[PDB]
Every structure is written in C-alpha cells, then in structure tokens.
Design a protein around this ligand. Structure first.
Ligand SMILES: NC(=O)c1cccnc1
Ligand SMILES: NC(=O)c1cccnc1
Ligand SMILES: [Cl-]
Ligand code: NA
Ligand code: NA
Length: 128
C-alpha cells in the first residue's frame, strides 16, 4: 500500500541524507515557489501508524492545521517536508522516529519509537 511504497520508493529529503524522511509527490502543485521560513502554512493531512491505524486527520475536523514554518512548532519531518512543497501539492511522507516523536511518543495514540506515514496537502502559505 501507500506506506510501503513511500518506504521503498520515496526520496530522501533530509539534509543529512540519513533516510529519516522519505517523500513522494502525489499531486503536483502550482508554480515553483515553496514557502519561506516563518510563513504561516495551511495544511490538510492524515496520519497513520505502522500498524495501519489512523491517528489524526484535519479533514475529519473540517479545518486546516496552521503553523509557522521552520520554527519547531511541528515535528521535524513536517518542517523539512512542508518546506519542499508547492502550493496545491499533495505528498506522502514516511518519517522515522528521530524526525517525529522519538522515544517519548505522544499520547494518546503514538507509541515510543514510531515510524509515521502522512499524506499532506499544502493549501496555502503567507508571510505575516
Ligand atoms: N507536533 C506536530 O507535528 C503536530 C501536527 C499536527 C497535529 N498535532 C501535532
Ligand atoms: N527545503 C528544500 O529542500 C527546498 C529546496 C529548494 C526550494 N525550496 C525548498
Ligand atoms: Cl494504501
Ligand atoms: Na503507489
Ligand atoms: Na515540491
């Protein structure tokens, strides 16, 4: 399925080239521009654990998730992955725990040492 495919066929987007975040572009976005550090970014996403369970979805909330890019307000994989995206792009990200929640995990649903799968849509970005 999609998690296996990004695991086996994804592109390493890390600056360390440590395989910690792998990406596949699913829907090509618009233009060439990617967001700027500090921009307000608006995303829709769904996240799955490696046991197949969905642990989060903004679609199910009927509102996007908003954060300031490159500030550590989200897991490292999202700061580095969203920075690669164009407006309107949809990608898959396969994130090792060192770029996610590490040994701590995150209650209620994310265990220790978890590799995570996300589908992310970059809806918009704006400098404030
Ligand atoms: N910390 C995070 O990366 C995050 C992203 C979306 C929802 N909750 C947490
Ligand atoms: N974060 C990146 O890899 C990147 C590269 C070029 C332009 N925008 C983002
Ligand atoms: Cl799938
Ligand atoms: Na595929
Ligand atoms: Na891109």
């Amino acid at each position: 399925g999609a998690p296996a495919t990004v695991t086996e066929q994804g592109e390493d987007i890390t600056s360390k080239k440590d395989r910690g975040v792998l990406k596949i572009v699913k829907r090509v976005g618009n233009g060439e521009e990617t967001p700027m550090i500090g921009d307000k970014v608006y995303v829709h996403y769904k996240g799955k654990l490696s046991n197949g369970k969905k642990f989060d979805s903004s679609h199910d909330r009927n509102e996007p998730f908003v954060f300031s890019l490159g500030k550590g307000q989200v897991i490292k994989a999202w700061d580095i992955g969203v920075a690669t995206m164009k407006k309107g792009e949809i990608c898959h990200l396969l994130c090792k725990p060192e770029y996610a929640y590490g040994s701590a995990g995150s209650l209620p649903k994310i265990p220790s040492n978890a590799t995570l799968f996300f589908e992310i849509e970059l809806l918009d970005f704006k400098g404030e």
